[PDB]
Amino acid sequence: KYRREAYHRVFVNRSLAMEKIKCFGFNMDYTLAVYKSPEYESLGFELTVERLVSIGYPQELLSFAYDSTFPTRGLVFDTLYGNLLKVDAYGNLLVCAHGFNFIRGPETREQYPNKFIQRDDTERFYILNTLFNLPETYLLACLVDFFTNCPRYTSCETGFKDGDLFMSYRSMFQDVRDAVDWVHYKGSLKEKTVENLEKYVVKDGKLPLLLSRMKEVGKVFLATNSDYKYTDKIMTYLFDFPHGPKPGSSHRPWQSYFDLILVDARKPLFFGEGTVLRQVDTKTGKLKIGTYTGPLQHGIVYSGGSSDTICDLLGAKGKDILYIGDHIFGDILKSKKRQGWQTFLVIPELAQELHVWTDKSSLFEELQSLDIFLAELYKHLDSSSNERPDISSIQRRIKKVTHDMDMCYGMMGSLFRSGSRQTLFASQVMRYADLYAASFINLLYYPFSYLFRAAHVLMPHESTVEH
Amino acid sequence: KYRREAYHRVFVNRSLAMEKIKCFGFNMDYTLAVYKSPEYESLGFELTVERLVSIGYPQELLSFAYDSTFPTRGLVFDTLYGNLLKVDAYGNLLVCAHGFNFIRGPETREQYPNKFIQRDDTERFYILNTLFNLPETYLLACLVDFFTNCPRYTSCETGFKDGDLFMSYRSMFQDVRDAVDWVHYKGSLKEKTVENLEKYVVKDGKLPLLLSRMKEVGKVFLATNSDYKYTDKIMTYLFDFPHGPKPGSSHRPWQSYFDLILVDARKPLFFGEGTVLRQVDTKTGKLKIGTYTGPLQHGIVYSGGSSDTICDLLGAKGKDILYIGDHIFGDILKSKKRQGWQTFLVIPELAQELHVWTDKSSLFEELQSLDIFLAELYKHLDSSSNERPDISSIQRRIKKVTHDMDMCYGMMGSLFRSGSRQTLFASQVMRYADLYAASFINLLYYPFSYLFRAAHVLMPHESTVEH
Amino acid sequence: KYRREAYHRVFVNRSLAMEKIKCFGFNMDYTLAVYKSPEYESLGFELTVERLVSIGYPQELLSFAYDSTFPTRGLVFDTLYGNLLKVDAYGNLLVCAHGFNFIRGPETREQYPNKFIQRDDTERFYILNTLFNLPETYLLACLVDFFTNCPRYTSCETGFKDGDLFMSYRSMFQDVRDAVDWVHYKGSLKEKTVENLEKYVVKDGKLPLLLSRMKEVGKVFLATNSDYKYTDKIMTYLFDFPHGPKPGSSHRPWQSYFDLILVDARKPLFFGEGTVLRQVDTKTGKLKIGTYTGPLQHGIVYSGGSSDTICDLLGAKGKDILYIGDHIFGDILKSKKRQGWQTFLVIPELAQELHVWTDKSSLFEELQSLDIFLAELYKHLDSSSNERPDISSIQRRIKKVTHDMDMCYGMMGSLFRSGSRQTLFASQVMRYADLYAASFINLLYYPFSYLFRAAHVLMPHESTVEH
Amino acid sequence: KYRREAYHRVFVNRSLAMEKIKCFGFNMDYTLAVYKSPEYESLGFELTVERLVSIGYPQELLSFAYDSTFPTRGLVFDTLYGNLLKVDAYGNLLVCAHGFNFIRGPETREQYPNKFIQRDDTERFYILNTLFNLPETYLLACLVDFFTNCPRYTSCETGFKDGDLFMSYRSMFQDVRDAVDWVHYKGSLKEKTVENLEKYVVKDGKLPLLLSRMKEVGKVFLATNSDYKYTDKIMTYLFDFPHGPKPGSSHRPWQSYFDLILVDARKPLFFGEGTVLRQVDTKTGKLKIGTYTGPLQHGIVYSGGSSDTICDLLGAKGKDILYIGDHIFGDILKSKKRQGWQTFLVIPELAQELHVWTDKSSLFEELQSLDIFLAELYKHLDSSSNERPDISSIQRRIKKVTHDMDMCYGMMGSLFRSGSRQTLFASQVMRYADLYAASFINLLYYPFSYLFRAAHVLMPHESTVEH
Ligand SMILES: [Mn+2]
Ligand SMILES: [Mn+2]
Ligand SMILES: [Mn+2]
Ligand SMILES: [Mn+2]
């Protein structure tokens, strides 16, 4: 079967007829504005450590340097025990690292009955799904690791003693949750991003190309959580080329690419009741007291609003809308809110994941062989056979190799799978995302008539027995 | 790769080393005692209809004949709208049946906001998961269909006018809930099973052979929900052969195969608090005055108890126990109760579903040809090229062929999937079962040294890109 | 101030000028047709018990005798714990009865977190508001009590073991819900009422006198939920006197008193969408082939319809209509449906409750003496003085005397209050009813020019400080 | 019966034994810290207008001067129509003012079907319950009034046109909700309060007196939403006297009056799950990284936390706690959260209310007379009488007089009642408050042994018929 080159591919959870698509919606941060890596994470990391120091934390935090090779996205911080957990779709622990000390085997079960956590218990466990969580994730490890090995800190099971005062991982987590939040919304993160854009944000003429062709088959809108001063800066840079969509054409403003522009969306509340629909005065970047209602002329820019409001202005309905973004949402209203958008989920980790999947075929093959052999020793055996062939050295070599394969993805494994088992993150992707790729940009390699036909997912009795 | 024949396979969700199994636990009903189909469904069906009529439902209910080709296990009854729903792992409706009229396409949105249900509502939706639910599934369809088309009944959104009386589907469903309950627990269902065991229950000497071999390598126990009177009749019939485990050998009683036997288990409550541990007078079948607990001397038959008590009585830890059964439980206590068994789930539908996967390969292969060709019509295309090639006709042949395939399994399709999407049921199997096969009997084809290595389950970007 | 005798009074929640009333609407059942007590309760009680037994409840249910001294109208059945709850306007438990054992003091907290229920849960709690609910109230108590104390039944938190069967209170309640429904709508309850009208229904010539006088000053209509067959029997019995309105005058048919008559009203649905407006063939009692709508010529008897259609047929606006009845509705459409009637609510308990307020004044006055004295023991005291005067004994005499008072109204006390706190029922009366009396008949003592001026309802700082 | 002087009285909704009280909890803002009136409201008003001007609103807003005689607490802003509504306990409109134009009579019904609003519809209606709402309330009127009469503004039904731009009352309301919030939490409101304390906050040596006696019979805690820098300033001023509790005694720090001090409570979330329990470093007023757990020694000061945490540290249970405050809470968790505090609700408006109730007895009397007379004209009348005595001039004089009585409380009537009918605010008081007074300070006139015995609330048939 013909398939495009792996790195251009859009992958398909649920089938989707692109001719049917009338409106393309865009997330900005980490979707059109891909922040550069590991620079941007380093930036967030350092400002968060500097905020933690300024509010009391010890100076050794300034020795911390963000390491992009530790965190995998989607881990669970357990504020009871201070652990970064990699669980599966149902709650089973696949990885448990205390600080940087990976708890391997039976001693996990000591803390976690049945190697199992009830991931609905959000008072105890915080999911770290988003791309911005990456620094917070490495940081939580650094903090747990440092205090655990710092002689002036007595480690107990839920935190650390220091004389009369006790700092629990729950208190420690909230300080980190505050700092992070403070950095995003009151620190210099936006500011220092906007003043060295070439170091932090990607630029690529494929962005104005693809959006322009999208605008010839349908409408294009932007629904971003950032304000207008931030969005104007970021979007001006992404469209700063000495031409427009194609070489030779005049450059045009980034606004000219969107039928509707909405900032201050307040997602996910955006997707329910919303906030009052407001309008931004594009000169001050402040909200106008008035708001222009009616037709959909260009030059207007909205703040607040609702999915319904955006859908009414565009004159669409949910299934006419392909929402393109890096965030995974719930369906807490899908059973009442009659309107339901399609989804394209951006998953940047896929780029390096696909490199491992190809550039490391020797480990996938050699696992295939150790399983061939295994399935051969037991060939002529049934329950009558009482032979116990030694397979320890084999069972050893499968661990060492699937661990090697794991570590190709970094110290916390693949985003989508630990060893054989799938992650909780993979399931949310399969639940939420009709389409997904490493960047939406890969839509450029598909015609807008394209029929995306879902990939079959097989249960064991389907993947391992022939027709 | 070498694989055992499809109909002897045990399938592996999570990997398992059998050499580490020190106890084999058995469900009785629909595990060891496979009731014959469609006879046993019919017998429950007719007694339930007969119980309903004896409380006032019209005499036309007696014209019903149970029909095995309609129900698929695991469907959801909507008590609001009187519909049988086949949903996916996340709540997406795959199939809506009001009685026998299948709601196809857009008028499902009319009743279900995004073709979606919030299946966490155990006041509106009822899962029909179990093999005993099959009659009650088909009954619900018949009842809603009859009152819909009976001229003397006015049909409403949420029920029927029965003259001056309003019969809500929810009130009608609880009537069917109580009748099934009453028939199983107080009617003639058990008695009419015992007095014609050959008509209702499967027999096979493979059962004592296997259980004899399990007792060579580990302890063996029976934890059933039935009473000892019924359990003696059933287990004695199943072991009525003019020889013991092998041919030529002396027959031994069915008790002799179990180091522990437990009736009145009251699962799932069994698996948490439980009930008081009782001891059955094997003679009367009534409970003893006390309970001689202590040594594991076979001859004692317990009533009630808890998972905890079995493990103590057998002197074993959870991970030593492989619990063999046909019921899917939830991990509601997995995060606290330090003891957690391994599981083998018996899924009988697998036999005839494996038949369709093999004797209907004309359809799988043709759908694949329609997918090779589809991919070929778009080989040289991109967002640049604006050809709109007509695919509607071939896009019609894919519907008819996936409908034909879905219909190879009955009117509600495969247990595990609808066309391409996986069923809620498939995912509950995935969460619960370490191993699964059409019958537990299939263990007989594997050495008890076997390493069951799990099947890789691929995401779209895994199944669709090469190494 | 001059007031009419207590037993002739009409009480005023919201003020009303009768001279502005242009239509008088009548509920039939338990308004115009006051069923005799305890005979009619008994007759429904015995048929419901007899319906339950015919579907499998034990024969001891036939030993039950309906007992008028137990139930108070407006109680809440908890389907979880099988309790009859008397709560206040905000959800505070005043009284908890498991069967006939009254839960007093601290073990109510054991079942109810703050002696409180979230009465918005129409899946767990059921309000028993209506005069037809009285039998079903007492029945629920008997049933829970019998299975609690019957030796062959094991009692659980949420139900009973009926041998191998679990009978939940919720499942037991819906059985009683359907039986009452069936008895009213399909059993012999109506027929056994018609064939001994003198035993079951009150008669009084004050009824035609009043309705004759209303027709002098305004239009008059009947909007009942019963059918015309039943309505003819009932209304003809009520008007069977050997004279018309006054003595000496010629009798006239019961129809002659109504400008419009409406059966099969299907209230409350009547009050919104409604049903199609139908016309009854007065001869057969079956529906005509069509409906001759138009002029208001008396002789036409309608079926179905809506509040809207009555107003159109009478050519009147809501505020012209005074709806006389015994049922309390909710303001679920009051904020949109521009049409809203005035209301007179019939509360029969008021007769004997007015008796206790007058013939038990020995108790009210003594409680007041205990309050004068209590206030006297603390006259010269403040946060300065630290005397702790012993009041426990007098604080005991206040309990026994408020219990004695509460018991002057039956085992569940007054309809409107428990000791000092007001009942949920009292506040629903307050929300719904403009006027209220023990019977609508009491209008007869007021001129149709009367200005009903509302009673001031004082807050503590109003009732307890002088001008 | 003996009663203390009206202005010293504590009023009693539900009975409460003060000997039973172990812990006294305190709200700060508007409870211990009574802000002076109308100065403090003026202050908030002006800063909010200045914030509205700075973000775009027209300069004429600076002409606004806060008028304390317009707002009554507890009104409903309807963002659809821009109306301040005074409704009753169930949704019935008692007052409707558009800006300063009081809609009186039938034209209300044009906008409000049945003079009724569904007050649960919080997307449309905002309740203005709190003391801080007073300026926002007057302001909403000023804004609606100004734009309505400003020639350059075209008034429509849901807002105002100004050429191409439309400003809806919903957009207008959110700007006011923002400004207000901004003033409280980022403007100079706290700041300018703290720098002229003698103009804004009341001081009274009865505060340290009463708290000291409370500390001799039980524990005292503070649970305030303000931070520690604000709380220290405010509390130091309230206890700035040249003595301690009594004349002649040494002054002691305000902290010495509390066993537990909690700031940053985040009520009402405080009363559910809470926030992490933190500790404040009393020198910086910033949060310590550590937190001291264990005994309850003085010198420690908490931030965040939970009702449960405060209750555990104090070693109490809900009914041991009398929570003293000016805010009215819901019981959204009262049906699950096992712990439930008693309540003392501070209602400052009561001071002036009680002056009207006494200093204006001539209007209450003259209404009593017009009702005596009314009840006399209709004395010798029944339904036989067809006399229509003219009572228009009387019915006129009752309106003019109950309007005069109303206006003694200000332009929007009493806090607790409009004319005869009670307000929605009065009902929440009766639901939430076990005790209430104009200031908690009145506890000083009651012994701590005092039994507060609820005031009887009477239904019409109880207040108007004798024993
Ligand atoms: Mn984003
Ligand atoms: Mn079973
Ligand atoms: Mn009625
Ligand atoms: Mn306050």
Swiss-Prot record, chains A, B, C, D:
Q: Which GO terms describe its molecular function?
A: 5'-nucleotidase activity; ATP binding; GMP 5'-nucleotidase activity; identical protein binding; IMP 5'-nucleotidase activity; metal ion binding; nucleoside phosphotransferase activity; ubiquitin protein ligase activity
Q: Where is the active site?
A: 27 (nucleophile), 29 (proton donor)
Q: What regulation of activity is recorded for this protein?
A: Allosterically activated by various compounds including ATP, 2,3-BPG/2,3-Bisphosphoglyceric acid and Ap4A/P1,P4-bis(5'-adenosyl) tetraphosphate. Binding of an allosteric activator is a prerequisiste to magnesium and substrate binding. Inhibited by inorganic phosphate.
**Which residues of the sequence carry a binding annotation for Mg(2+)?**
27, 29, 326
Q: Which EC numbers does the record give?
A: 3.1.3.5, 3.1.3.99, 2.7.1.77
Source superkingdom: Eukaryota
User: How many cofactor units bind, and how?
Assistant: Binds 1 Mg(2+) ion per subunit.
> Any idea which positions bind GMP?
27, 29, 177, 181, 190, 224-225, 267
Q: Where, by residue number, does P(1),P(4)-bis(5'-adenosyl) tetraphosphate bind?
A: 129, 337, 428, 432
Q: Which residues bind IMP?
A: 27, 29, 177, 181, 190, 224-226, 267
Which Gene Ontology BP terms does the record give? adenosine metabolic process; allantoin metabolic process; amide catabolic process; dGMP catabolic process; dGMP metabolic process; GMP catabolic process to guanine; GMP metabolic process; IMP catabolic process
Q: Which residues bind adenosine 2?
A: 411
Q: What is the catalytic activity of this protein? A: a ribonucleoside 5'-phosphate + H2O = a ribonucleoside + phosphate; a 2'-deoxyribonucleoside + a ribonucleoside 5'-phosphate = a ribonucleoside + a 2'-deoxyribonucleoside 5'-phosphate; IMP + H2O = inosine + phosphate; GMP + H2O = guanosine + phosphate
Q: How does the annotation summarize its subunit structure?
A: Homotetramer.
What family is reported? Answer: Belongs to the 5'(3')-deoxyribonucleotidase family.
Report the function annotation for this chain: Broad specificity cytosolic 5'-nucleotidase that catalyzes the dephosphorylation of 6-hydroxypurine nucleoside 5'-monophosphates. In addition, possesses a phosphotransferase activity by which it can transfer a phosphate from a donor nucleoside monophosphate to an acceptor nucleoside, preferably inosine, deoxyinosine and guanosine. Has the highest activities for IMP and GMP followed by dIMP, dGMP and XMP. Could also catalyze the transfer of phosphates from pyrimidine monophosphates but with lower efficiency.
Tell me the protein's name. Answer: Cytosolic purine 5'-nucleotidase
The species this protein was found in? Homo sapiens
State which stretch of the full-length protein is shown.
Answer: 26 to 492 of 561
